[PDB]
Amino acid sequence: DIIIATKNGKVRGMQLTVFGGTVTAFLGIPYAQPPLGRLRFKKPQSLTKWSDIWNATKYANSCCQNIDQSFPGFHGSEMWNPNTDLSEDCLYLNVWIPAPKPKNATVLIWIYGGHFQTGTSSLHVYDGKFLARVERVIVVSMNYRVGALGFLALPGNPEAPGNMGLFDQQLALQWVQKNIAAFGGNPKSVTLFGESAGAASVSLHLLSPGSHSLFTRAILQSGSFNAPWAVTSLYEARNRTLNLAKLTGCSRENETEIIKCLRNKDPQEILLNEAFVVPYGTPLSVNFGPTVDGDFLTDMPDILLELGQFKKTQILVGVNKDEGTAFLVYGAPGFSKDNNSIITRKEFQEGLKIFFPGVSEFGKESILFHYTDWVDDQRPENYREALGDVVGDYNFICPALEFTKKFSEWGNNAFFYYFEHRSSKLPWPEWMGVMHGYEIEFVFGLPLERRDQYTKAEEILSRSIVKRWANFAKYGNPQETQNQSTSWPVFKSTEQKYLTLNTESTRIMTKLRAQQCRFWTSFFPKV
Ligand SMILES: *[C@@H]1O[C@H](CO[C@H]2O[C@@H](C)[C@@H](O)[C@@H](O)[C@@H]2O)[C@@H](O[C@@H]2O[C@H](CO)[C@@H](O)[C@H](O)[C@H]2NC(C)=O)[C@H](O)[C@H]1NC(C)=O
Ligand SMILES: *[C@H]1O[C@H](CO[C@H]2O[C@@H](C)[C@@H](O)[C@@H](O)[C@@H]2O)[C@@H](O[C@@H]2O[C@H](CO)[C@@H](O)[C@H](O)[C@H]2NC(C)=O)[C@H](O)[C@H]1NC(C)=O
Ligand SMILES: *[C@@H]1O[C@H](CO[C@H]2O[C@@H](C)[C@@H](O)[C@@H](O)[C@@H]2O)[C@@H](O)[C@H](O)[C@H]1NC(C)=O
Ligand SMILES: *[C@@H]1O[C@H](CO)[C@@H](O)[C@H](O)[C@H]1NC(C)=O
Ligand SMILES: *[C@@H]1O[C@H](CO)[C@@H](O)[C@H](O)[C@H]1NC(C)=O
Ligand SMILES: *[C@@H]1O[C@H](CO)[C@@H](O)[C@H](O)[C@H]1NC(C)=O
Ligand SMILES: [Cl-]
Ligand SMILES: [Cl-]
Ligand SMILES: [Cl-]
Ligand SMILES: [Cl-]
Ligand SMILES: [Cl-]
Ligand SMILES: [Cl-]
Ligand SMILES: [Cl-]
Ligand code: NA
């Protein structure tokens, strides 16, 4: 019997066998009052408190969300879909602890992505037991509200203030500060890590003064709040809430009455209608996401980043080589995960229209001019490759590099990586290369499980990334010091060094996508 006394009452865990040892897991500990009825759209309230034992022995409900139904039966897409029941009653977190119980372990808190509209902490690729077993860190992960239920905003109105899902995350951090010591964790050694919308969340926790004392350091995998899809304007946010109201027959003149009507709607009606609030979205559109609320975020985050108003600490930031390809099969013409997707110039042009619906003819022309300087060949896959790079550079790579540059200008150590290894198991086809989302399994150490038929070179690579990430968490420095590795240099503006992660040549390079990012970061905002 593994019973731990938390601030709120006792919880029961279970033991797992992992690589010839044990990890103790507590799956599904509640951390907030379930946000139902009148609590829908509100900030999470603190937990009622209980005597007797809460059994934390299975993953909890995932938050309400629309499911990816694009490729039924296909593992490449369905692996991302939730794997417990959907419920509004979903504010639970998970804790993996090394055995024997550690004395004062560093804690890593994972925040999932899913574009702020989907995701859950229970996915197989987010299973923290390997990290716990291999590096003797404590791993924690939480479910937080997404879509309208988590991000619906009528700014200043505490019935629906915005950022509720970011506040769920923050309450989970607070839970760790208050309880992790009872589990053998060090509340003073907490690293946040997250991928995509989860990495954008981690970066907003660097900006939010309520989060400042709830963590030490931060790891941003393929995302940051300055990505163009990650923060919603207050004009866009109100238009969208108003639209959702109209769509559900919930339009009233009293802002407060609207929320009351929305609170009487069942979650399916809200979910069904979220897709249609943006008047024309793209495959990267965020219907309801982070807003400037005067609470979690006290000002536009670009202004805070530029003027140095953020927690001074070390960061670890990186991207994958083909960030953009995953999105091409969710609406660009001529693209398919079942053939080689060789597209013409014409299709390339129509694909720009899908990703850049608001942009002038001049603006799309200058994207094309910039990305079609073939040295060389011509060379059938030229346009297919160009569109993936457009989408990946504009949405993920140039913003992560810009985030890292601006952050490091205020004198902290930053480390940047470029992940270029394509999983031997990737279910998506070869043309999609090193996709968005597919470093996660290496970070969580899935290729260390030799029963799983990743390659030896993959086990070596993951073992090494697990060590770098644990070293950054524990010591603020992501070295692998023992195996004659490449030293990871700090990223500074000026040299802008970064490390590549792959199975052969890990190397130090500079100025990733220099020409492309000058285009997106400085020229494109003007068109
Ligand atoms: C690669 O496939 C695309 C995708 O559409 C197709 O899915 C395929 C697996 C295929 O079996 C086909 O039946 C299905 O329509 C092909 O583009 C499609 O081409 C046709 C015109 O022939 C259009 O009617 C479709 O709208 C268009 N699809 C999309 C999403 O735009 C594509 O040509 C094929 N590419 C090759 C062979 O290079
Ligand atoms: C937000 O306000 C209006 C409302 O438009 C939305 O109404 C919803 C109920 C939903 O059906 C959604 O598709 C629709 O967009 C926007 O007006 C739209 O956009 C243009 C304006 O020139 C028009 O073509 C339509 O009147 C309307 N769209 C559709 C598809 O019918 C308005 O643009 C938007 N506000 C912004 C962008 O700030
Ligand atoms: C556990 O270690 C505590 C502090 O260690 C941390 O100090 C911070 C500066 C930060 O760097 C962390 O990463 C360091 O690990 C110490 O204060 C506590 O007393 C310890 N508690 C124990 C051993 O039970
Ligand atoms: C919790 O855990 C154990 C099963 O391992 C059991 O003895 C007890 O009934 C449980 N309490 C429940 C299910 O409420
Ligand atoms: C609108 O309705 C709410 C809820 O009953 C009320 O408290 C509020 O004061 C009203 N405001 C206006 C301006 O009518
Ligand atoms: C370092 O080297 C050996 C292989 O010679 C291996 O057993 C060990 O896991 C490696 N450690 C890391 C952290 O990569
Ligand atoms: Cl599963
Ligand atoms: Cl704004
Ligand atoms: Cl490249
Ligand atoms: Cl042309
Ligand atoms: Cl190396
Ligand atoms: Cl250089
Ligand atoms: Cl490059
Ligand atoms: Na020009």
Locus of tokens 């940051």: 224
Q: Indicate the resolution in Å.
A: 2.1
C-alpha span between 11 and 51 (Å, rounded): 10
CB atoms within 10 A of CB 342: 15
Residue ranges with strand state E in 296-445: 315-320, 414-419
3 pairs with which residues across the strands?
Answer: 12
Evaluate whether 122 touches 70 at the Cβ level (below 8 Å).
no
Q: Which two tokens stand for residue 220?
A: 């941003």
- Sequence ranges of the domains in the chain: 1-527
Cα torsion through 474, 97, 60, 116, rounded to 10: 10
C-alpha span between 310 and 35 (Å, rounded): 30
| 366 Cα to the center of ligand 14, angstroms | 7
Residue 464, ligand 6, Cβ within 6 A = yes
Q: What is the distance between the terminal CA atoms of the chain, rounded to a whole angstrom?
A: 64
- Per the annotation, the verdict on 75 as an active-site residue is no
- Per the annotation, the verdict on 115 as an active-site residue is no
| 353 Cα to the center of ligand 2, angstroms | 18
C-alpha span between 60 and 121 (Å, rounded): 9
C-alpha span between 70 and 330 (Å, rounded): 8
Amino acid at 513: R
- Per the annotation, the verdict on 323 as an active-site residue is yes
* DSSP-derived secondary structure letter, 470: H
State the Rg of the chain over Cα: 22
C-alpha span between 450 and 252 (Å, rounded): 59
CB atoms within 10 A of CB 521: 17
Evaluate whether 73 touches 117 at the Cβ level (below 8 Å).
no
Fold adopted by 1-527: Rossmann fold (3.40.50)
Q: In what order do the strands lie in the sheet with 53-55?
A: 3-6, 9-12, 53-55
Evaluate whether 287 touches 276 at the Cβ level (below 8 Å).
no
**Which method resolved this structure?**
X-ray
| 515 Cα to the center of ligand 12, angstroms | 12
Backbone angles phi, psi at 4, to 5 degrees: -115, 130
C-alpha span between 97 and 131 (Å, rounded): 9
Ramachandran class of 430: left when φ > 0, alpha when ψ lies in -120 to 50, beta otherwise: alpha
Element (DSSP H or E) covering residue 369: helix 361-371
CB atoms within 10 A of CB 362: 9
∠ CA 442-445-451, nearest 5°, is 110
Residue 257, ligand 5, Cβ within 6 A = yes
DSSP-derived secondary structure for 135-186 = H--EEEEE----HHHHH-B-TT-TTSBS-HHHHHHHHHHHHHHHHGGGGTEE
C-alpha span between 219 and 108 (Å, rounded): 10
C-alpha span between 367 and 290 (Å, rounded): 28
What number of residues does the chain have?
527
Backbone angles phi, psi at 126, to 5 degrees: -110, 15
Helix axes 398-408, 197-207, angle to 10 degrees: 20
- Candidates 465, 482, 486, 501: which one to mutate for ligand 6, based on the most atoms within 8 Å of Cβ? 482
C-alpha span between 498 and 486 (Å, rounded): 11
Helix axes 382-392, 361-371, angle to 10 degrees: 110
Residue 479, ligand 6, Cβ within 6 A = no
